[model samples]
Target: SGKEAVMEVQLSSTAGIDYTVLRDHLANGEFREAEDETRALLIKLAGPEAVKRNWVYFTEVKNISVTDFQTLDNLWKASSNNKFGYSVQKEIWVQNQKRWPKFFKQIDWTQNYRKWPMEFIYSMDAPRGHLPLTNGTQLFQAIMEHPAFEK
Candidate 1:
């Protein structure tokens, strides 16, 4: 919903559709048609040549996996430059709750759903090296004590 909302607004300025309509179509899951219209609008606003140059940003999100969902949710909560940050600034959560509006549905957006530890994402940033070949007391001890290697 990050880029979708931002891009929709950017497109709405030229696309002839109200942002409310675009927002409803997007929230209601008419993504393909909404995307096509948004692209068409972008092309109309920017001209064909300009579109070709900005193609990288104009592209929509294709597939979202669990990791992407988690990452985006974290960024939304943590990043000052994210869509949810704007929401926080406007006090959207409190407004929505008070309005009793069906516009925003509640999802189980909890950190508890993640089963993996922080180490998994951290290990991905491991320093590039020879993977510790010296086999000192530390390495050998690790190899010996490791349950998978014991047998």
Candidate 2:
């Protein structure tokens, strides 16, 4: 709720989406809330029906405007100093030779069999590129392949 900040944040969205809450959540280190907001944002971008149903699958993912994607990525990157985000996750994946098991282990997501989102690490102390949960590789894959991640 202060203005002693740079222009990187506090900007309007190209897709007319509201990321202000998400922005503030990340800025305040509320990774858990930010993660939930990220999923809500994704479903909102997916479409109206999906939002109504509270479900948006990888095969049904849509919209994902590059501008919005970059906006979200920037929010995470700026909050954690580039430690968490889809791009960072992609980098780690490639650095590990795109090995799923290795990447999961490296990110510390591989644990004893448990339900998704039940045993997640929700703090800055979590491994890099491991903030926003993706249930595995579905959303992560779509994120890596999105236009917003182009170098």
Candidate 3:
């Protein structure tokens, strides 16, 4: 899978300091590990107080800028060759005319028609853009409103 090459690039680009483990986990298709790493990174970047309150709202702060999101997005995209990432999810959202239900279906998120499962499957085998999990639509909403997506 080109995972090793991409992982090396990301690691070297960051001076082999930050996100090294996260990048490695993602590159190796360890979604569970990547998801845990993402949460930790969010807390580290957004602060414990803000993260405890709500990561989606906390990420709106300048401390956790769009660049932060873009870094994660790029990691996912590069690791999966555009098959994953927030931006990839955003494209599906746009294609579905910004309808959550339709977008969910498009991503095979529902086991029954218009009915989301009790819990989402969180693995590399799961749908792309299904990671960095959230409780609801907050993450998607944040991605859509992110300045990076703005023309």
In terms of TM-score, the best-performing candidate is 2
Clashing residue pairs, backbone N/CA/C < 3 A, model 3: none
Residue 82, candidate 1: Cα error in Å is: 8.0
lDDT tens readout by residue for model 1, 1-151 = 5334433332213233234443444445443344344344334343446457653122222121223222222222222123232123224334445332221222112213322232111111222210111111232222223232222
Top-lDDT candidate index:
2
Cα lDDT tens digits for candidate 3, 14-124: 212277778888877777677778767755666557667645452443455566667777787777666677778878788889889888777766647423233666555
Residues 10-81, candidate 2: write the lDDT tens digits: 545665788888877787777889899989988888778778998777765546677777777777777776
Order of the predicted models by lDDT, top scorer first:
2, 3, 1
Q: What's the TM for model 1?
A: 0.23
Query: What is the alpha-carbon lDDT for the whole of candidate 1?
Result: 0.30
Candidate 1: residue pairs that collide: none
After superposition, the stretches of candidate 1 with alpha carbons farther than 4 Å from their true spots are 1-21, 48-151
Give the TM-score ranking, best first: 2, 3, 1
Candidate 3 at residue 44, lDDT? 63
Model 1 worst lDDT window (10 residues): 127-136
